[PDB]
Amino acid sequence: AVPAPNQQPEVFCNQIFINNEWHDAVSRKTFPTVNPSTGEVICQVAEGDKEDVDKAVKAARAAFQLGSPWRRMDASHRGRLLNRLADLIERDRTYLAALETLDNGKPYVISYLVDLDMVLKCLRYYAGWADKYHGKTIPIDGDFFSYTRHEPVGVCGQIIPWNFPLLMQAWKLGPALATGNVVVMKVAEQTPLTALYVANLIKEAGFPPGVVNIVPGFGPTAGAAIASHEDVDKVAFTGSTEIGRVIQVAAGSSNLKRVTLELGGKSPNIIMSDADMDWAVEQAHFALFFNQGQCCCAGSRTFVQEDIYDEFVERSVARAKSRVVGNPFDSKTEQGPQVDETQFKKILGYINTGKQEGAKLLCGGGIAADRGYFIQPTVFGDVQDGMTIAKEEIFGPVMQILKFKTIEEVVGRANNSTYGLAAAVFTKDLDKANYLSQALQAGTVWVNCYDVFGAQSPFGGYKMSGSGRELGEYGLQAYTEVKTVTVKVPQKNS
Amino acid sequence: AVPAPNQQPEVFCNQIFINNEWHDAVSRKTFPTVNPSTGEVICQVAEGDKEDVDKAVKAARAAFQLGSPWRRMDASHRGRLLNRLADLIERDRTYLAALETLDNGKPYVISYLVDLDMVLKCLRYYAGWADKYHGKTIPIDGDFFSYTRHEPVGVCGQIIPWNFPLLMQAWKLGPALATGNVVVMKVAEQTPLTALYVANLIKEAGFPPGVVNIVPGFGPTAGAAIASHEDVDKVAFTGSTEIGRVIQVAAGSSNLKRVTLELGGKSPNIIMSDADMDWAVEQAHFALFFNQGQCCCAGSRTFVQEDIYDEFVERSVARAKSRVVGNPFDSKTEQGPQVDETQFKKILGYINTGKQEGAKLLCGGGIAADRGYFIQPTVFGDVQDGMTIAKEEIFGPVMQILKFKTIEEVVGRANNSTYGLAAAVFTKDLDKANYLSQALQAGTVWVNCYDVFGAQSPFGGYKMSGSGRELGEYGLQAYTEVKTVTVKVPQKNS
Amino acid sequence: AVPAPNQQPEVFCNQIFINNEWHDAVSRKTFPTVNPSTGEVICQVAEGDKEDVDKAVKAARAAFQLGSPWRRMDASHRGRLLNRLADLIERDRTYLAALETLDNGKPYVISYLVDLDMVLKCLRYYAGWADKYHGKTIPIDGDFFSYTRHEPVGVCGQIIPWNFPLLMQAWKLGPALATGNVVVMKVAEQTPLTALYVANLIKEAGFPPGVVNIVPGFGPTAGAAIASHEDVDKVAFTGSTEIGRVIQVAAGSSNLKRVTLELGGKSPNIIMSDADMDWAVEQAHFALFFNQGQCCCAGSRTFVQEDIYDEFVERSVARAKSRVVGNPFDSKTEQGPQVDETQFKKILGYINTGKQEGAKLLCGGGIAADRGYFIQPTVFGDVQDGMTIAKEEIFGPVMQILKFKTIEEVVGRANNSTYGLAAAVFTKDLDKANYLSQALQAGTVWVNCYDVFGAQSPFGGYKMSGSGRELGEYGLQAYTEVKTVTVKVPQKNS
Amino acid sequence: AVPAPNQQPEVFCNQIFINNEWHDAVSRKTFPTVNPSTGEVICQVAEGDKEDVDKAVKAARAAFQLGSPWRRMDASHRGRLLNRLADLIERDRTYLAALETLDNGKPYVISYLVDLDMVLKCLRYYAGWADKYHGKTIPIDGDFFSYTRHEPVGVCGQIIPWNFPLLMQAWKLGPALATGNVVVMKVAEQTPLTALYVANLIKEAGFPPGVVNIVPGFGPTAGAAIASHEDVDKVAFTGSTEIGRVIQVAAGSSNLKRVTLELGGKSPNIIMSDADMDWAVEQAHFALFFNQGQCCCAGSRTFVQEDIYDEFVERSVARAKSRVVGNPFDSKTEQGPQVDETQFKKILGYINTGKQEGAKLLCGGGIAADRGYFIQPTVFGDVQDGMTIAKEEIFGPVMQILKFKTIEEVVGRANNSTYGLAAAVFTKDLDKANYLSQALQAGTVWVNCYDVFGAQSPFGGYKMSGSGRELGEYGLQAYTEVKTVTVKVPQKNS
């Protein structure tokens, strides 16, 4: 029941969003955005700069002053504003899905049924938490009355990736606005249009000026300026590991602001010999090739027991060869183009390196179309732990299948990594499922499923995959600082 | 590593415990306690009366007055007192286990390794919750500061059964003293000695006078007096369904005091065809014959699929025939005598009725010894749902095995009862385990185990098995009334 | 900004609401509803009966069966349905306010700005809690994995009073539908129209058939049938103490169903000599004369220190004499008529008895209009604790002012009652405020304010004022039964 | 009731504690510890090095492996071990207090009645949280069963300051061992003996080898090695701001390990004109001169309204001049010597700079004794915001009194700082207290009290004073990583 899409929607939101008004860059420099399906320029977006970041941060700080309309606003009213924003987004669902498809390149059906549905669910979920994050009345010793108040941390600088523009923007705006903070958001240079349109919808919803500010920046300049600003109380970053380390170093060296990181990973996928063959094959294919493999928790490493290795490999190759690649607006299309040329060339180089290392190429391994950044679904068999493709995040539609013999060995091999963002287990035995769920050192473990993301369930990673959580009640912890008030009383009684 | 027991320990605590002092009954009437292993009288215990209950309630109310030492005491100090009581109980572990064996009749090894260990664990667990039951700072609308304070409900009247004297006494004293309440406890007429010795230990521990009061009463007179007293803010009862209904009616007609009930049940046990045969048989035998079958959550109904019915029945009969019955102080003894003559005759009548109804008698079915209340382990096969033994709680060492064909049918048959205290599932499939755990209408569901009781895990029952919970954090809810305080502030800010 | 009201709105919802359809009474008997402002009949409403209650309970049980659309519905979808119902109610806000004014008699401005605003706030608040009531993963000892699941209790029978039809209906429907229960509601015979229109809106919102059922019954027959039905898992009652005791006795004697009571009270009001005179006088007048004094937590007892007794009495008399009584639809009207003739005559008799007992009559004390149930604002001075008016709930616009000398004496006198529903303290000292808030034995304590009701803040009473809470997170506890699932694991690790 | 102290207790614990065994430094280098009361050397302590840190971290990682005794240990058993450690510490309370006095220089009465009492309270409090930190069973959408498990973060490197050796060591060990982590602790070079004796007591208590490891290091070498080690999952630091920034930078550049900081502050103290004069003066004196002013939350800035400035200044000077300085083991002694010569010279330089800036010297300002690091109590009046002493943390017995006129001005001046660790308000008005508690940007706010530290109440700071909390339930969050497990089920029901 997908409505008819407009393949070339109009683009007008291309400036910096500050104080519920659109301002051009101080340097007047603009950067172009490229449609990945065809390689042509969609529109020109103003390039964020350090001075623009300073203006946005000053506006946010002014909006966060004590006694301001945002600070005096009731929590239930903040939830009502979030619900109003969600309703406004749902009103323009078709246009937002079309713009997301045009800018990112993901299939329109996926954008309409998955991305925007999850955005609405996340916004409406964090609308509820506005007036339900209670404190505590501490029963301290002596004739004292102690209690804790949950207060907004302050100005929050948020940097979102390009794989899920709307979804990550919702995940960042939900808890921040629910807890009463002000946001100075930096969007990815690849996909800036959807965030700007959402900012216009935010202005329409009725948020006070300066609460939400979006600065579209082209490069690490705006991100570094946000992470190094003194008035930014907290910085939240989601992206590559190197940029995350740079942001953390800059934040620690600037004002010791709170830092929350959500980096990439090398999430494994374990298939036990007793698992349902068809369901396991389909779920592994979906886990690896979802969003053209541009997922932080993609199941790149697929561990299959020696008993069912041959049949699983054959079924996976057959399924991958039948995947449809083409124009995302087409109904039959299952895989769209890559986000940009850089990722296209990086994935091609990764495929070439994997072929050089001796991994068996089962299918794909080349360009899918002469125009656009389309890559054929690639599957690598007989992959070893020493191979580069088995250790680095390809971040593309490349499948690697590894063989294991015993459960202890597969646990040791899966946990032998610097990333613990996610993991999966496919089996029908209760004991094996429990043991694998407990032993695996992953932030999220899925049993007989994959990519089951809910706003209620927190998401995070161990080791160097990041720190903290971004979903559920745990997400509210990062955007809140606890204040303890102790009052002397004439006499305390139980 | 069980220490050498004293088969005839001295009994001196046989009076009413009020205000940390021992008082005789006002009417000077005493009731005898009978050793179940031999049928002889152990000692004479003063019989509780309505006037004695009034004296105990007056003492408790005096100890609960505002500004009293108990009310002004810090929560951490209450936890320290609970830990001190637990240490004192552990110091006299051997004597308490011997007295429990002498009075109840359960094996000494069980009393030392299971009952007292669980008592210590429960006391030390509820010691921790003394200063960790926080309130909430409600984020109400408007310029108001609202918060909730958890206060003791008041004088609590508690009636404990005879199957687990020490364990039920600990389960009742833990949350009540942890939340800062005063206790007026009524103990079972069958096993009153252990509770009185524990009361003496409570006096030694250092509790303020009047905090804990124990009135040993012979019959429903003391229980009715406690449940109908006006100064009793809350009544907690654990026992038969009829007495629970009477207590609830009296409490509702007296002063609308809060009532918490924990009645018996007819907990089923389901064995799937794919379950581990040896483990399932052993766990079913332990589930049904634990504590001579005198358990509220005994797995009386054993549902076995038609595929493994014959082998399971044969193994269960073989295991039951090998059970050792004899003197509880003997090391090799596995089953002791019944609590009293009334239960002995009731179980004999139930066995006779089951034989009359046409159920196949596999083993046992008669008296085990010429002296004492010993009953042979009885197993009934080919039991139908219409049989009386399949519907009423025998509360004895009688095993009933029922046959089922499909999982939907077994769910419908197991849930077709007025009791939902507990249930069990034995299987190796994940989907079957999850579906059975979700479908069964039981307060507690065990998978591949039984009688796994932890102080942390709450315990309760659905339907007419009772209301509320007695373990874990949920146990603290019943013994606490919430007070909300709202204060007008000059200006509220997030 | 109150829209123009329709003084005589059309009435069409006058039948029994079962399975999203309107059915006449089986006996075809109808009872009339009387407009309190004029004494004329508004419409004829079908009279509920035991057979109709049985039909509604059967429909609710059918809708609550495992696998039904309501049971399989996601929690977030239940919250969305609640939000949709709130939006539908807000769409017809003017008509609902006009009908509430026509049926109850409260001023239209109050109905539009207070009652319906609170109804919308409560519904939207309990919409949020749909998917945020998590369980617990208990860390039990041994190689076991234990967790708790919060499940709906089942069919809930709810009886609502007549003072706040829409507000109490929302307070009952919020948590019940949020936790996934089915409702069989019994409405007051005085004000049945608004609940039926809300039921029609519920049908329009999209709830599955049988989830919500409303049976308008004339008398205690329907209430007794609901409280004594075997398929009703939980009964919630809000009203007089005697009917609450009867309901509790019947429920305990029928199937031991869970009972939650919210009865009336004699809430005191304490004015300290250092309090702000104008604010204290205005808040006391609002506390006592709100909703024509037809509030369960009305500040009937007004304790004023001897220092400011004369000035407070003079100001209270002056304020009471200036209160406007007349047609509720008039803008200048501040007090409407009483709910029915019975309350009118009872309040007149209470005023006569208070005059006979020797209490000084300061103002009012008679009928306010020759047509309708209008009573002049009455104030009684020099009231003693032994007077009947100082002990019984008049439930009308009668003010009683009592004098106290010391804070300990006023605490002792205020707590010397069988009701603890609410209390208030007016002062500027921190120590006095804290001591009074801690010492008073009231379910809710207000400081320098009164009737500050928020959906987030729980509401309840001590002693015989009721049991349990109806607002906030505490409200969800009553409509939920906890199931514990313990699974044996091969090996447990921290 | 302070027992007789041994002024020169024996010192034997002077090595590195690894695997429950004492090992000398690999380089065999030892650093001396100096008694502050006399300036003589107490004993020689082995100097920690990077290689020793590597050995300790390897031992901790070995003890943290899956299936190890520490990992398989029950949570209740961890709480029991913590309680056993607390009991062992209480057994040697006198010796520990004497050693603390000998090494730190604080008065023996303070060490016995305050420091060790708080250590015991903290240990026994965190013993309770061992088996009470539940997870959540997330109600996710779809046919899925999702839940969260709280797991230990891993090897934790902890660096403790010298002002409160035992208290900070307990604050670090409590949550870390309660949540099931392994500790590699670095102690201050000034006071290493007490931590080593506590480590010996830990070995005696029965902790498995490698769970707790203490490396006494002389300088930033050991701290940098701990913060830069790859196997250290989390680092917790408490000390100066510069070292905290260095540690955060190193941790971010090494492996992105979680960092928790608790730095110093410039906590203000506000005295309103209506506050109790005697209580305010005494509490301000205690707040500033507690522990010789070597407190992170010392009330250095004392804001006094112009109405009571003169009387408050006179009373503060009179109280400060009467403070007793001398040998800490003497009963009449109220203030001991400084921790070391460096702090002595820094405080002298700060006093000289304050005198140069034009601040009025009221009393003190020089050396108190010819032997030892004793400083006279110094009070500075007419202090301005531009003065250096009013902005930098003197960390000594220097009092600064500032004058303010209005409440808005004092709020603006108090919040105009880079530190928000703590604040205090002294008044009798309710509105002023609430407004000041809400407006002040401090981690902890005290009303009519100061330094009211309870294990239950969390402690932290805003701005650059640190991040996170170290006490209460909030303390457990830092030492725990959340794992989410989602399992597909055949059919989900509410």
Author numbering:
A (entry chain C), B (entry chain B), C (entry chain A), D (entry chain D): 24 to 517
Text taken from the publication that reported this structure:
Here we report the use of single particle cryo-EM to identify multiple proteins from three enriched heterogeneous fractions prepared from human liver mitochondrial lysate. Using this approach, we were able to simultaneously identify and solve cryo-EM structures of nine different human mitochondrial enzymes: short chain acyl-CoA dehydrogenase (SCAD), medium chain acyl-CoA dehydrogenase (MCAD), isovaleryl-CoA dehydrogenase (IVD), delta (3, 5)-delta dienoyl-CoA isomerase (ECH1), aspartate aminotransferase (GOT2), glutamate dehydrogenase (GLUD1), mitochondrial superoxide dismutase 2 (SOD2), catalase (CAT), and mitochondrial aldehyde dehydrogenase (ALDH2). Functionally, the three acyl-CoA dehydrogenases—SCAD, MCAD and IVD—are involved in beta oxidation and amino acid catabolism. Finally, SOD2, CAT, and ALDH2 are all involved in clearing toxic byproducts of oxidative respiration.
Mitochondrial ALDH is localized in the mitochondrial matrix with a primary role in metabolizing acetaldehyde to acetate in the alcohol metabolism pathway. We collected a total of 82,360 single-particle cryo-EM projections for this class of protein images. Based on these projections, the BaR methodology allowed us to construct a high-resolution cryo-EM map. Subsequently, we were able to identify this protein as the ALDH2 enzyme and resolve its structure to a resolution of 2.66 Å. Matching with existing crystal structures of the ALDH2 enzyme, each ALDH2 subunit consists of a coenzyme domain, a catalytic domain, and an oligomerization domain. The coenzyme domain (24–155 and 176–287) possesses an NADH-binding site. Both the cofactor and catalytic domain (residues 288–502) contain a five stranded α/β sheet followed by two antiparallel β strands. The oligomerization domain (156–175 and 503–511) is a three stranded antiparallel β sheet. Presumably, residues W185, N186, K209, E212, S263, Q366, E285, and C319 are engaged in NADH binding and C319 is the catalytic residue. However, we did not observe bound NADH in our cryo-EM structure.
